[model samples]
Target: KVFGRCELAAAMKRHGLDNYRGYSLGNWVCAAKFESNFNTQATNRNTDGSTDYGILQINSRWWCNDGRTPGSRNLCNIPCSALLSSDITASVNCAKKIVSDGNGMNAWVAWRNRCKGTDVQAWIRGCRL
Candidate 1:
């Protein structure tokens, strides 16, 4: 389990995620809120044989290999379990790489359906930067 919005905001600031990867802090914050409610250990089963993992709900089909899936392509070069920890450094790094690979937060459906083109001020509101 992890902390709430303000706590995450401060941690993200410490991690230099504020306005990172050409996106605003609010963008990432909003994504996290909808992604896993800031819970790092979050996971969800997909209709496909693969499952989503981590705070960002990274898809096993593309980003992680849980050992059961043969020929799993782990683009993050890390285990899926790594994404399920409160220490988000790895998750943040992997997410940055995902964004840097040209997908942007569009890699996260939550970002596209819930955060894209939407007002994100409420996400970072009252969070001391």
Candidate 2:
């Protein structure tokens, strides 16, 4: 389920990133690039015993229930598998709630480390908005 850069940008736009946290869509694109490279089925386990889920790499510790990860907060009230699907309706809704929580994209370390202050234009360079 790996999306090409343009495809992902279109999806992001369709998902309503224009009003997301007042941040540029590039920031979201950068976050998605660094998080999981737009691969919907991507998963990674952190050393802290939490697993990152989906395109945004949302953590199990505070987001969704994977039915296996310990200390899951399930704040998104979604099954972790839902995040892995190609359809991102659930993930997008969850991401919106996460960004509006005040910390914004700071919820993703990838956004902080890789996208912050970086030129994110390349993320959508050839994609017509």
RMSD of each: 1.4, 1.3
Question: 21-110, model 2: which lDDT tens digit per residue?
Answer: 788878888999889988999999999888888998988888899777765689999988899998878888899989999888888898
- Which numbered prediction scores highest in lDDT against the true structure? 2
Model 1 stretches astray by more than 4 angstroms: none
Residue 118 of model 1, lDDT score: 88
| Winner by TM-score | 2
- For each candidate, what is the lDDT? 0.82, 0.87
Poorest stretch of ten by lDDT in candidate 2: 17-26
Q: Can you write out model 1's per-residue Cα lDDT over 77-114, one digit (the tens) per residue?
A: 88889889878887787777788777777889999999
10 residues in a row with least lDDT, candidate 1:
63-72
Candidate 1 RMSD computed on C-alpha atoms after optimal superposition onto the true structure:
1.4
Residue 9 error, candidate 2, Å: 0.6
